[PDB]
Amino acid sequence: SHMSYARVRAVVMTRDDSSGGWLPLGGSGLSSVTVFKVPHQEENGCADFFIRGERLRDKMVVLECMLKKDLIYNKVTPTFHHWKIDDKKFGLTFQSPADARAFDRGIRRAIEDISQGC
Numbered sequence: 001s002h003m004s005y006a007r008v009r010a011v012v013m014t015r016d017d018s019s020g021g022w023l024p025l026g027g028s029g030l031s032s033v034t035v036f037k038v039p040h041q042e043e044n045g046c047a048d049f050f051i052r053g054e055r056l057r058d059k060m061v062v063l064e065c066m067l068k069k070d071l072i073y074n075k076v077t078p079t080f081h082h083w084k085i086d087d088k089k090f091g092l093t094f095q096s097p098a099d100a101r102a103f104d105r106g107i108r109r110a111i112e113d114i115s116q117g118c
């Protein structure tokens, strides 16, 4: 309900065997990327926040990650962002700078809301 922070269609990007490049994970197809909160117990107390990417054609979950307060966000272009949570990285190729900005507020609110509870 008020559990979702953002939902956009984008292409999931993974860091390549090269050194500093990014490529789309598998297909070049769009995925349904959402950011959401999952209550530990009480619907309004402490919770965990996840980023989830589901490929549109075969509904395969190609990305699933738990947000953490220390996470780093990187706006490279107005249409390409990538983040680092602990040791690994994921990135997104948005369809518009709009979607990108909407998603960014989303992740931002979610991160700030992480300690809501204790």
Ligand SMILES: [Y+3]
Pocket (backbone or CB within 6 Å): 109, 112, 113
């Ligand atoms: Y808040």
